[PDB]
Structure formats: C-alpha cells, structure tokens
Amino acid sequence: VRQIAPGQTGKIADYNYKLPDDFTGCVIAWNSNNLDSKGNYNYLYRL
Amino acid sequence: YQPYRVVVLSFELLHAPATVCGPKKSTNLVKNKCVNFNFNGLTGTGVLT
Amino acid sequence: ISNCVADYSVLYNSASFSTFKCYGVSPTKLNDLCFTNVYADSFVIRGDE
Amino acid sequence: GKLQDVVNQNAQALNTLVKQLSSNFGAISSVLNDILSRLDPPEAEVQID
C-alpha cells in the first residue's frame, strides 16, 4: 500500500501502477480479507 | 512485539576512487560533441576536449 | 564489503522488506554511482524500534 | 594611487563573486551535478532551490 505514493520503487510502482509526481487527488485503502479469501488465486500482478 | 531483521548500509560519495558500482558498462567517448558524460559516477553536461 | 559489482535493483524490487529507506541518495539512482566504501551492519530488534 | 585603487576595488569584487560558487547555503552539496546524480526530482527540488 505504501507504493501508491507519488515516487516510489518496487514492482507495483515500476511495473503495474504509477502515479505522476504532480498528483492532485486522494488515495483510499481498506483491508478486505472477508471477500477476497476463500483462497482466491485469480488476482494477478506483473513480475 | 514481533522480531524484525534490520540491515544498515553506509556509503561514502566522495566520487574519486573505485570499487562499488552497478550493472552498466562503458560505451565510447565521442570527442567534441555536447554529451551527458559519466566517469565513476561524476556526471555533467559539456564538451570533451 | 569491497570491490564488487553490486545490483541494488534486485533488493528493493522484492516484497521481502517492509522498510527500504535511503537517506543521502534516492533508490532509483543507486545503479549509477561508485561508492568507495560500503559497510553492512546487521541485528534483530522488535517491531516498534 | 587614485587610479590603482579603482582597479583594486573592481578586482576584489569579481573575486568575491567567483568564490561564492563554492558555498552550499544549507544544501547537501555546492556542486549542482552532485545533487542531480544522487536524488530524483521530488527531493532534488528541495536542494536546488
């Protein structure tokens, strides 16, 4: 979750989703263990 | 209260001598053209005379 | 640690670490710099400290 | 001596302007290429200002 800040390293800010440096907006996050774990293996990410 | 493992790395960036630099290799030197040069880490824009 | 060819991009691009905080440098730039001297210090502490 | 004093006062002032290029004014370096090679432009903007 810490990699969804403007200017980060790691393979979800370098390969998946990147915010610009001059970003105006809000980032909202909440834990969802109830709905996405049975468990669920159809959530993918680039490596 | 759980155990965490910590590493601390310490550099000295006085830019002169040697010994720790990463995964890129020397290209050529172009001799009188405006470039972005890099010698052991020390960069700059100029003309190589 | 001395006289290496390091590769810092293997380190921070893995999901092992919950803290990767560089101080005088930015982590993007570490693959371009010759560092003269590297020390590596290790211990185990608690979560708050 | 009235003519030499004008030459001495103008030379002393241009020498002071050249030596002011080696102050860092609170930044991590006084060389602008050492800031741009070690930091990425979010926090390199703080030192360049």
Side-chain angles (χ1 to χ4, degrees):
Chain A
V1 157
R2 57 169 263 277
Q3 304 184 40
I4 312 298
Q8 292 298 324
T9 56
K11 60 164 64 68
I12 75 164
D14 288 330
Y15 300 149
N16 289 113
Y17 186 83
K18 162 99 157 176
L19 284 165
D21 288 306
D22 51 308
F23 174 65
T24 302
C26 304
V27 183
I28 310 165
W30 67 102
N31 165 52
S32 67
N33 189 23
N34 316 270
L35 310 164
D36 284 11
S37 306
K38 297 192 293 291
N40 216 15
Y41 311 146
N42 53 11
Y43 284 128
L44 300 102
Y45 70 101
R46 195 170 303 267
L47 205 77
Chain B
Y1 265 102
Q2 302 194 19
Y4 278 75
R5 289 181 182 212
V6 189
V7 195
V8 172
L9 300 151
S10 177
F11 318 113
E12 282 293 344
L13 283 157
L14 60 89
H15 282 116
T19 71
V20 194
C21 38
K24 55 178 66 178
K25 193 264 177 183
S26 316
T27 184
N28 289 319
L29 50 93
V30 295
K31 296 312 282 282
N32 307 69
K33 194 266 180 184
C34 293
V35 298
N36 291 320
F37 51 88
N38 200 315
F39 297 78
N40 299 151
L42 67 93
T43 187
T45 299
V47 175
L48 301 159
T49 305
Chain C
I1 287 177
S2 53
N3 193 205
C4 276
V5 179
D7 194 319
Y8 303 90
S9 295
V10 195
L11 278 72
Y12 52 81
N13 275 358
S14 296
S16 295
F17 319 120
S18 78
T19 287
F20 205 110
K21 296 179 73 68
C22 296
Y23 279 86
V25 197
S26 287
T28 307
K29 299 278 178 176
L30 282 159
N31 306 86
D32 303 85
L33 309 165
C34 307
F35 285 114
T36 309
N37 183 340
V38 177
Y39 287 108
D41 308 338
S42 296
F43 39 86
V44 191
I45 65 175
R46 197 182 70 190
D48 290 332
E49 286 84 3
Chain D
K2 300 179 63 173
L3 287 188
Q4 185 76 65
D5 279 8
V6 180
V7 178
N8 283 350
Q9 275 168 31
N10 288 335
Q12 171 80 58
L14 274 163
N15 284 336
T16 300
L17 193 65
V18 175
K19 271 75 169 177
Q20 280 289 92
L21 280 184
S22 52
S23 320
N24 51 59
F25 302 105
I28 66 163
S29 183
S30 68
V31 186
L32 194 57
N33 288 334
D34 301 10
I35 307 178
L36 289 165
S37 79
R38 285 164 41 160
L39 298 164
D40 52 4
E43 63 261 39
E45 185 148 349
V46 183
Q47 308 306 319
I48 290 176
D49 285 0

